[PDB]
Amino acid sequence: DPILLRPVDDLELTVRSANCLKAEAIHYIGDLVQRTEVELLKTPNSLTEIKDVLASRGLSLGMRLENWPPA
Amino acid sequence: APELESRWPRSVVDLIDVLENELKRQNVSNPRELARKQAVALSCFLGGRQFYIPCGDTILTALRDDLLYCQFNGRNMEELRRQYRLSQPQIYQIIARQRKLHTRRHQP
Amino acid sequence: MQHDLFEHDPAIRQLIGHIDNIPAPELESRWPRSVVDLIDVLENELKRQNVSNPRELARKQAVALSCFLGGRQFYIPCGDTILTALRDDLLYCQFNGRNMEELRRQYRLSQPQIYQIIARQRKLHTRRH
Amino acid sequence: SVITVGYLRLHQCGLPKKMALELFKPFIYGKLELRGLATTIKAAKKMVE
Amino acid sequence: FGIDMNTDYTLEEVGKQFDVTRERIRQIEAKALRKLRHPSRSEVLRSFLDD
């Protein structure tokens, strides 16, 4: 998959979501797609603009990936 | 005496050391000789002319600015504001600017 | 011991050591035009000395130059004075206070001139610290 | 130069390489300028030296 | 400098043509002298210092 190796910078997302995600120091896309929706909602300020862009880019949270990160 | 120094080359001398302390700090071989030839180029480059040198940290802002964007980690907006004595507007501006900068780097 | 200008203010010193993480073309875009004319000129002599990283090193001198003379009114002479100044500086350094006669043969300058040279660089070697 | 024997073909002569650069020297200057290898003709003279 | 002319014109001679200003024309001269000394057009000219 040519997207797991690309960092978070390729989302063109909102400033609120961009600020919220990097508070936990996320650098790649794979760890976003690793965590499920039931823990990322504890961060203040987000629940209404990730699913649409993920579907537009053909990705979804909750799936499992082994050997991650592959370094 | 000051007017005598007005056209004095003392400024030339003052500079070889300005070059020295960075070259010695960066640890290159042979400070003095490198810096004098280094000055001679400026002399020929800038002989007998009015020149505005960017004054009063203006360059140092750009380097102060780069480090701050590196240490901006998303929720410490107060932390780097004390430690640079800057203000909320300054922080926001530098943040957005360097964000666009890196986005041009990651994106083609 | 790191005894020199950037020793007094490490903040400027660390900034000088932070330009490596920023590549040149974007950083020079934000800089005033004048220092851009400086850096390539400082670069021009550098490759003539066959020193590595001409772009990287040339930036380091430019920022330090702006650091001190930023805020200061600076004049430059040109012509024979420069190597006269260069000769004066070598005379001051070679001058160990015991080889003045050696310099009298190395530079062959009138006795009052030698004192003027010795005195003058002494002022230049006092204001820095 | 002195004359020595040639394996050579009927339309060829063996010309010493040391003489050739001297005889054609303007030709090398021009060709080397055209190739853009040296900025000026004096630089080309330095190269042939 | 008298390029492509029978003679060169001094500062007074060129003043009566364009402007009697002395320092102005002198500093335009210095402007040109720096603009030529930049290592973007001086690369070829630097090869003529040996002569």
Side-chain angles (χ1 to χ4, degrees), chain B residues 1-48 50-108:
Chain B
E3 298 187 0
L4 167 56
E5 309 155 9
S6 73
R7 317 177 195 175
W8 261 11
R10 27 53 168 172
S11 274
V12 162
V13 187
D14 315 301
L15 184 147
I16 297 81
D17 302 2
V18 171
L19 297 182
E20 221 142 55
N21 85 276
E22 45 86 11
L23 296 161
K24 169 246 166 185
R25 174 209 72 55
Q26 163 276 339
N27 163 273
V28 59
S29 163
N30 271 329
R32 197 79 198 183
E33 324 76 339
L34 265 276
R36 35 190 77 255
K37 337 307 181 42
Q38 250 214 310
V40 183
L42 329 166
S43 70
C44 294
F45 171 18
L46 184 32
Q50 296 181 342
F51 53 104
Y52 79 104
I53 286 174
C55 284
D57 91 342
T58 303
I59 278 306
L60 299 167
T61 83
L63 257 283
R64 167 203 78 187
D65 294 6
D66 179 40
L67 163 152
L68 163 154
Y69 182 77
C70 294
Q71 331 310 147
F72 175 31
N73 58 45
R75 55 309 177 271
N76 62 335
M77 197 148 197
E78 262 325 319
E79 186 181 13
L80 74 187
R81 208 175 63 75
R82 307 300 61 50
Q83 82 70 29
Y84 264 128
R85 157 231 61 60
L86 269 39
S87 68
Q88 293 177 335
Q90 276 158 346
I91 314 299
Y92 281 105
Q93 300 155 329
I94 308 300
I95 291 173
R97 184 181 305 178
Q98 300 261 3
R99 285 183 167 181
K100 316 149 188 172
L101 298 178
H102 293 228
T103 305
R104 314 162 203 183
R105 313 177 192 183
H106 298 255
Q107 269 68 5

Side-chain angles (χ1 to χ4, degrees), chain D residues 39-43 46, chain E residues 43-44 47-48 50-51:
Chain D
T39 87
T40 178
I41 171 173
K42 274 182 133 253
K46 301 296 149 152
Chain E
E43 290 88 304
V44 284
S47 45
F48 294 95
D50 296 318
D51 50 83

Side-chain angles (χ1 to χ4, degrees), chain C residues 37-64:
Chain C
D37 313 278
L38 270 289
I39 178 174
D40 54 45
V41 158
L42 276 311
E43 249 160 56
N44 166 280
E45 53 89 12
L46 190 164
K47 299 155 325 302
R48 265 194 276 97
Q49 316 319 296
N50 330 296
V51 183
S52 52
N53 55 89
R55 200 86 213 168
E56 181 67 330
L57 203 58
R59 307 172 248 189
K60 285 178 176 160
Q61 298 82 67
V63 278

Side-chain angles (χ1 to χ4, degrees), chain A residues 3-6 28-32 34 65-71:
Chain A
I3 304 104
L4 61 93
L5 320 91
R6 258 289 184 178
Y28 274 78
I29 220 162
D31 38 28
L32 288 313
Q34 278 318 109
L65 162 71
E66 294 294 328
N67 63 41
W68 175 256

